[PDB]
Design a protein around this ligand. Structure first.
Ligand code: 60P
Length: 119
């Protein structure tokens, strides 16, 4: 029932994601010089360093907000990919599955703690 526990749990999940080779195209903003049409397709860019920095600045109120930004990294990859068989998109699918598998308990524990607090 620790209402604050989600923050360090998310910091540790982010460390695992940064060690995963599949995260490399998503660690920093998409290079607009390499993909000049990126902002014509994507309205809101997102990357793992921005998620980490937002978390570290104390600018997420809940793990649900962090989840929404991580999921935006994956929907952007799905929207920008020219093919569902592309290399970078194939990396985002695996990383999405890894993230969803690990974030489920963080969300569940946080929601459980809030419910206990409301009692
Ligand atoms: C950044 C990028 C470039 C080609 S596919 C892709 C993606 O995010 O799926």
């Amino acid at each position: 029932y620790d209402i604050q526990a989600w923050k360090k749990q998310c910091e540790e999940l982010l460390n695992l994601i940064f060690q995963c080779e599949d995260s490399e195209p998503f660690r920093q903003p998409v290079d607009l010089l390499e993909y000049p049409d990126y902002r014509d397709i994507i309205d809101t860019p997102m990357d793992f360093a921005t998620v980490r920095e937002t978390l570290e600045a104390g600018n997420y109120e809940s793990p649900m907000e962090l989840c929404k930004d991580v999921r935006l990294i994956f929907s952007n990859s799905k929207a920008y990919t020219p093919s569902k068989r592309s290399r970078i998109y194939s990396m985002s699918l695996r990383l999405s599955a890894f993230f969803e598998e690990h974030i489920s308990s963080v969300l569940s524990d946080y929601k459980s703690a809030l419910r206990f607090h409301k009692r």
